[PDB]
Amino acid sequence: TSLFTTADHYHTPLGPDGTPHAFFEALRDEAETTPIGWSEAYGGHWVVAGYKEIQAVIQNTKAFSNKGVTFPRYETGEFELMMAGQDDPVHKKYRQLVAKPFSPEATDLFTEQLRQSTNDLIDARIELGEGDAATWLANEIPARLTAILLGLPPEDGDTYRRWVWAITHVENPEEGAEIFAELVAHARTLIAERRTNPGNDIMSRVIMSKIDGESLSEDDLIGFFTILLLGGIDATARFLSSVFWRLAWDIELRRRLIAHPELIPNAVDELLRFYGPAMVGRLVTQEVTVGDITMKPGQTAMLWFPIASRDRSAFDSPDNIVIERTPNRHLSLGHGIHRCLGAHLIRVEARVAITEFLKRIPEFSLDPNKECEWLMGQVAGMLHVPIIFPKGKRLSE
Numbered sequence: 059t060s061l062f063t064t065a066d067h068y069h070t071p072l073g074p075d076g077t078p079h080a081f082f083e084a085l086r087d088e089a090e091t092t093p094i095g096w097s098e099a100y101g102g103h104w105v106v107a108g109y110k111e112i113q114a115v116i117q118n119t120k121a122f123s124n125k126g127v128t129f130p131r132y133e134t135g136e137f138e139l140m141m142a143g144q145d146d147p148v149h150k151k152y153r154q155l156v157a158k159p160f161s162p163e164a165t166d167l168f169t170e171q172l173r174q175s176t177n178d179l180i181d182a183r184i185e186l187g188e189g190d191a192a193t194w195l196a197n198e199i200p201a202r203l204t205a206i207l208l209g210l211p212p213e214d215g216d217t218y219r220r221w222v223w224a225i226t227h228v229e230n231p232e233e234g235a236e237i238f239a240e241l242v243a244h245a246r247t248l249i250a251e252r253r254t255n256p257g258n259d260i261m262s263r264v265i266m267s268k269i270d271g272e273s274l275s276e277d278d279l280i281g282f283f284t285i286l287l288l289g290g291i292d293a294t295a296r297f298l299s300s301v302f303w304r305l306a307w308d309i310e311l312r313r314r315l316i317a318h319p320e321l322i323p324n325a326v327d328e329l330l331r332f333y334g335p336a337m338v339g340r341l342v343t344q345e346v347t348v349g350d351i352t353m354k355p356g357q358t359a360m361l362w363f364p365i366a367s368r369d370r371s372a373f374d375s376p377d378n379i380v381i382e383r384t385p386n387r388h389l390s391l392g393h394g395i396h397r398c399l400g401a402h403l404i405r406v407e408a409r410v411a412i413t414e415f416l417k418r419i420p421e422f423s424l425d426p427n428k429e430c431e432w433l434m435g436q437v438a439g440m441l442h443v444p445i446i447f448p449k450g451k452r453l454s455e
């Protein structure tokens with residue numbers, strides 16, 4: 059039988075370590091024979107697993123549209139996902155609006171603020187000898203930075219996370235769509251505020267932008283607010299969560315990063331290749347053949363980046379975290395026109411989070427009396443990472 063037949067990104071079998079990795083490795087093995095397979099989940103769709111097959115699809119925008127970027131579609135009411143859910147020429151026009159603020163140069167001005175914030179966060183529990191690395195640190199670092207970027211209150215991470223939960227999971231329609239509406243209500247308030255009292259944040263910038271000389275509609279602005287809050291907060295928190303979990307038990311990886319801080323940027327890349335949370339969809343717009351498979355219009359193809367990132371044709375020793383790996387052309391941040399807008403930013407956030415955490419708490423391990431939990435979906439990673447460590451001292455407060 060085939061692992062593709064029941065492949066489902068929201069229901070990936072977990073191995074004894076609590077991750078979907080044993081399954082990903084088995085699927086990677088089958089993909090060497092069958093790089094694309096049909097899954098009966100979600101009414102029938104294609105699962106693209108080979109690295110070259112994903113390349114092939116992602117590069118063919120004529121036949122594979124981003125109208126199917128999320129599948130099943132994320133709950134955003136009547137709003138489309140800004141940039142992510144569009145094809146050119148529309149997609150390019152909107153992305154040029156936010157390209158500067160997201161340029162490495164524009165985000166790098168937050169680097170030291172990130173370091174300080176990460177250290178202030180660690181201070182909150184270093185004296186306690188225990189904490190859930192995901193909720194205490196991984197969820198907070200990107201949520202607080204994203205907040206500041208969008209001109210939102212850094213302290214309300216919990217309300218933002220609830221909106222994301224609704225958008226990506228919450229199985230009850232009414233629920234998910236009603237909570238997404240709460241995000242919309244808040245966006246509208248924020249937009250009206252910035253309209254009169256502009257700031258230096260990204261929302262203020264797009265609010266004052268124009269396409270074809272005309273100002274953006276409130277719907278377009280809510281669209282930007284949404285995709286940026288989701289991007290900045292979801293995958294980033296699940297990726298950092300998975301990295302803290304890995305460093306909690308992998309004493310070998312951990313000691314090397316402490317001994318060779320200079321290898322951290324490279325390691326972050328390798329860790330992005332191994333724990334990349336994302337899987338993305340494409341809507342088929344015309345008959346197209348990729349490998350042995352011919353897809354039909356209206357069908358959906360899911361790009362299983364985690365499998366391709368383990369393709370022996372593209373990576374030597376794919377199942378090992380080789381921190382000195384270079385070049386590392388993983389597909390965790392996409393490729394082509396939809397590349398992740400937040401690529402440099404997640405790299406800096408991880409670099410900073412890892413560096414300061416290991417500097418502050420070099421010794422720690424998973425809590426033997428509390429459970430870890432892995433969230434599945436289009437953005438997958440550890441949701442809870444209870445750890446313990448010797449009690450330490452705050453830097454401030």
Ligand code: HEM
Nearest residue numbers: 141142289290293294297336391392395396398399400404
């Ligand atoms: C671990 C962190 C992250 C991962 C693994 C990730 C992954 C991705 C992937 C796979 C794409 C391309 C989707 C496609 O091919 O259609 C993408 C798109 C996008 N990401 Fe990220 N992302 C992450 C963090 C971020 C951050 C920090 C932001 C917040 C600004 C962000 C903003 C976006 C945007 C706006 C797009 C749409 C790009 C376009 O369609 O042109 N991402 N991301």
